[PDB]
Design a binder for this molecule. Sequence first.
Ligand code: HEM
Ligand code: HEM
Ligand SMILES: Nc1ccc2ccc(CNCCc3cccc(F)c3)cc2n1
Ligand SMILES: Nc1ccc2ccc(CNCCc3cccc(F)c3)cc2n1
Ligand SMILES: C[C@H](O)[C@H](O)[C@H]1CNc2nc(N)[nH]c(=O)c2N1
Ligand SMILES: C[C@H](O)[C@H](O)[C@H]1CNc2nc(N)[nH]c(=O)c2N1
Ligand SMILES: [Zn+2]
Lengths: 405, 405
Amino acid sequence: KFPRVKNWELGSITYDTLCAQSQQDGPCTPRRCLGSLVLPRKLPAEQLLSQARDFINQYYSSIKRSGSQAHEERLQEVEAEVASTGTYHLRESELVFGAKQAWRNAPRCVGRIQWGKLQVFDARDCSSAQEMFTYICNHIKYATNRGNLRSAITVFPQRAPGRGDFRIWNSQLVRYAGYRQQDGSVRGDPANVEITELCIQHGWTPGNGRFDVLPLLLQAPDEAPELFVLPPELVLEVPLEHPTLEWFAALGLRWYALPAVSNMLLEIGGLEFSAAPFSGWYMSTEIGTRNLCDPHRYNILEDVAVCMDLDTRTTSSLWKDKAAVEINLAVLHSFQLAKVTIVDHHAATVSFMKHLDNEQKARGGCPADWAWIVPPISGSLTPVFHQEMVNYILSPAFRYQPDPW
Amino acid sequence: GPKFPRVKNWELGSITYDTLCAQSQQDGPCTPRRCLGSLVLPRPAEQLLSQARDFINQYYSSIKRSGSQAHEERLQEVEAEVASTGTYHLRESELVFGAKQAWRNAPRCVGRIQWGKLQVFDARDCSSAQEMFTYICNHIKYATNRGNLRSAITVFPQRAPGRGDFRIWNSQLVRYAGYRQQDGSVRGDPANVEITELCIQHGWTPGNGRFDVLPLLLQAPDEAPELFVLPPELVLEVPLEHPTLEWFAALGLRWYALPAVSNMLLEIGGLEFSAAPFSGWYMSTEIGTRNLCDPHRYNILEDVAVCMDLDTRTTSSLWKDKAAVEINLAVLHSFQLAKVTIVDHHAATVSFMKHLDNEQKARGGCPADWAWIVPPISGSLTPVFHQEMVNYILSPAFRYQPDPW
Ligand code: HEM
Ligand code: HEM
Ligand SMILES: Nc1ccc2ccc(CNCCc3cccc(F)c3)cc2n1
Ligand SMILES: Nc1ccc2ccc(CNCCc3cccc(F)c3)cc2n1
Ligand SMILES: C[C@H](O)[C@H](O)[C@H]1CNc2nc(N)[nH]c(=O)c2N1
Ligand SMILES: C[C@H](O)[C@H](O)[C@H]1CNc2nc(N)[nH]c(=O)c2N1
Ligand SMILES: [Zn+2]
């Protein structure tokens, strides 16, 4: 049954027919909804072949040439390759199309209005961790573009049956070290304690600051990962200050410009790309609310509240809310002043509503994960709160994969 | 490991498995292919007897007498009653147990820590619209208790073979009118436009303010509903003021004290109580964020922001967020000053986390609808954001039911 999807602010209704194209089960059943789970529980040539055919069909339909010579000859090449070898290879233009489609299909992404504007670097000719690093540096330099951020992805060689994966061990290309104490507390970013510890153990000389940028651990197939320090000139950061509260800069807070996620698997036509780091730009709430105010991240709410002289002794003063707002304001202000691309959660959700509408017209639906699309402050103040959404898995897709250690 | 959903808290790192969901006998709207958890309203002799036997089994476990001789004699009496009459009837203590359990089972209610403290008024002897009114007045008086609110439900007679239902037409016992204007806008609460116009069709003389309390339309079996005006002294209201912004009082905003929901069906052991109004107290975001700030509700955000002198011409000022926070603060401050029970969103979510722990031990789980439990401002600042939840239907249950017209 095709779901009816209602917007409760406007009264409008659509029907999602794209979901019938899903060949891939999520975590829910009629007995119970597991839509709030962050990760999946779990984490043959005929099956590869049908995923391949389907993807090649998606590709040819996208260039309008769907039935042509070229199309039927490509299907046969894929077929011949699979049958003889158990696997196949994409053409670069197919890869480019598949990478954009993976982004488009990602239900947790509120930035998808931008899905067609993606620079794709083909790095499938990579044979060593040293070469990975070179490609990574060019990606960063390109994507960063002195603050005028440009969306990008770099695709390293696919998984192959007989061998280890290319992997980037770090979860993003820029991460701040998290240093555990003998007394259990963390200095820096508690989300990165484990990667920090792996880095030291592979020979990194640690720092002891709150915002020490980590080296990368890059792994070529079946080899120990190697360590590469990013040149500081490549890592653009933004000092945080507040437009009217002058002590705020005194807090010594900063964040990096480029969100470049480096641990997700890209799946295109049944092929799997274990190292395919991608980047866009930040939505301010990711920094201002989560990364700075999460209790298990930098957890700065209390410090900010005290500096604002708020009554911290009682939840009902809404001290937490008030301090969060000002931190988000600082991030927006500081990024604007530094001429580094960023989008606020109001503008982002308004763009995503436009996206839903474009996708309704173009494909009869849009898979979206409401819990992830609605921002972590001011939820009901954004239009996406009032929008019903259908979550399902289309391919090409970005997926999670096991940590390689 | 365990063959049951694994549930993680990402703030604390802790894991539980929900075994309770095994007890669900009713499908929700999700399938492996697509998740529909964000939809608001997704769309009998042996059947009754099986629901009835299960509910009686639940009652007998709750008083620890399962397999007892009184347990088996009650089961026989329910078979016999259904046998000869097509239906059966609950003992008083079974109704009290069922009502509390429907509350405990409600996945969308963040206030469930209070589930065992529910006063159950048995109004199953009611035989007229006028008597419903008296019962409802008494409910309102007991529950309001001059500001020190007490949770309560009043249960009118069950649906019965052939005979018409008891219904309260109004969605809550207190509703402000919504008067559709010539210019297409609404004075009052836009949520209540259809109920307002029903009231006037049924002979109410409408006012023209923004906070006109509506009459009730009450319907006894096989009759036209009858209109009843609540005496104003029974309807406690709280004028909104802000603790430091002295002009806020001048806006003339107010809200009523008692959230008393009146259009839900209470289902117990396959019996159906079509009128069973219940009340608790408010969480402050219901008033300050949704009712006052939804665009399709009082929509006051821009007005408040202009009084605060914010820059409303750009999203990135965070004007909506700053206004909403102040409006929520005024709600909390005003209810406090007036001594009317209210709970803020931090204290409510903290208590709900306690609830989850209590239910993990008492029954192996707790059905919860993450999108509804997480408050509409300051989401990730509350501990429930970071908590995975499993949503499923257990009975006894409160259910939506179609409007009586
Ligand atoms: C151009 C600006 C972009 C913005 C503002 C943006 C925004 C976001 C946000 C806010 C999230 C949620 C992140 C979190 O809470 O952890 C997200 C998730 C994601 N976005 Fe984007 N996006 C952008 C570009 C991209 C690009 C370039 C890709 C891939 C090519 C992408 C793929 C994803 C994926 C796969 C997720 C899910 C991540 C996960 O499950 O952990 N987005 N997006
Ligand atoms: C004691 C104080 C209580 C608090 C603070 C409270 C809080 C809430 C809130 C905030 C919601 C969501 C409402 C909305 O967003 O529309 C809710 C939903 C609900 N609560 Fe409560 N609750 C309380 C008591 C009650 C009681 C006494 C009952 C029944 C006996 C109840 C049953 C429900 C149900 C059925 C819903 C779901 C409503 C729907 O689907 O529209 N709760 N609760
Ligand atoms: N601005 C952007 C754009 C794309 C992004 C893609 C992914 C991410 C990060 N999401 C990680 C979510 C997560 C954190 C920790 C554990 C986990 F399973 C999942 C952030 C993004 N931000
Ligand atoms: N504080 C309380 C306690 C119990 C409540 C029980 C129910 C409600 C109202 N929720 C109605 C949600 C709703 C609005 C509009 C359409 C719809 F289907 C559902 C509010 C409550 N607030
Ligand atoms: C448990 C819950 O699903 C989890 O905390 C999710 C909620 N929504 C989110 N939304 C975004 N955008 N990013 C997140 O990490 C999460 N976390
Ligand atoms: C589309 C979405 O499900 C809808 O707006 C929901 C989201 N969460 C909610 N949560 C609560 N508590 N109350 C609501 O009305 C809603 N609305
Ligand atoms: Zn689901």
